């Protein structure tokens, strides 16, 4: 095989899983044998289209912030708080909205200070909530606001009591967009499990963090391929509020291929 040896090479460098890698060459080979001739130049194009077709449709990516309540939950240290700040900063400064915070992360030390200092900078109010009732109450106070950004404590969501804890603290009944936050630095086999545990909770979008920190995006692709939802944001550094961005399925696949 000629350029297909090259396509085989690309797929190698992305961290995609073997099954997938293979099945992509199948589709690739199939198409090209039975339909015209592909150059060493034009392979990549076709390759990317094929991969992209395995990801959720674009209308399921880059969902904008509309709902009143914006919740991020996810793994420990993944960057939830930092990302919440960025998101909020955008809502106030760029989009000129009345914003407020709730935090639920009573567990980790200084997590409240952390969000507090952001809320102070942004001159927005902040409620700590230990219970759904307190949360429901907080809702009353913030009824005049446009957006309430809600932070939560990172847990080992492999163990499902924390899924329970979470569900028993957040009212998903509400006008609410919920983002599952995972680190681009995480192992696929790990994320796979997390996403299973989150099955019983209404996640709207993924957020992938620290894409500036990992060598390959294959792991993230692998997750997205087995998912019915797309990615709302990706983060690429520690700086607030600059280091956030959005992507389309194609835009994502381009990143995948270096």
């Amino acid at each position: 095989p000629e350029p297909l040896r090259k396509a085989e090479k690309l797929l190698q460098e992305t961290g995609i899983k073997e099954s997938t890698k293979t099945n992509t060459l199948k589709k690739l080979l199939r198409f090209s044998v039975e339909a015209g001739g592909l150059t060493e130049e034009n392979v990549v194009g076709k390759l990317q289209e094929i991969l992209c077709d395995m990801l959720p449709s674009a209308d399921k990516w880059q969902e904008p912030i509309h709902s009143k309540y914006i919740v991020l939950f996810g793994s420990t240290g993944a960057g939830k708080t930092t990302t919440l700040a960025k998101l909020a900063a955008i809502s106030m400064l760029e989009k000129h909205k009345k914003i407020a915070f709730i935090t639920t992360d009573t567990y980790r030390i200084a997590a409240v200070e952390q969000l507090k200092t952001y809320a102070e900078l942004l001159q927005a109010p902040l409620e700590v909530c230990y219970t759904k009732e307190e949360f429901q109450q907080a809702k009353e106070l913030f009824s005049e606001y446009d957006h309430v950004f809600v932070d939560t404590a990172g847990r080992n969501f492999k163990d499902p009591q924390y899924i329970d804890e979470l569900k028993e603290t957040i009212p998903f009944e509400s006008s609410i967009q919920s983002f599952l936050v995972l680190s681009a630095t995480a192992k696929y086999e790990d994320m796979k499990h997390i996403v299973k545990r989150f099955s019983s909770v209404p996640v709207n979008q993924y957020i992938f963090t620290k894409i500036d920190e990992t060598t390959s995006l294959g792991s993230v692709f692998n997750i997205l391929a087995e998912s019915k939802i797309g990615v709302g944001f990706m983060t690429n550094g520690q700086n607030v509020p600059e280091d956030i961005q959005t992507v389309s399925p194609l835009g994502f696949v381009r990143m995948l291929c270096r």
């Binding site: 700040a85 900063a89 200092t117 900078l121 942004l122 520690q238 700086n239 607030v240 509020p241």
Partner: peptide, 16 residues
């Protein structure tokens, strides 16, 4: 020097 440096600068400017 602070991961929030930029944001801080933006808020200072708003104030102005």
């Amino acid at each position: 020097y602070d991961q929030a440096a930029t944001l801080r600068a933006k808020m200072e400017k708003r104030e102005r």
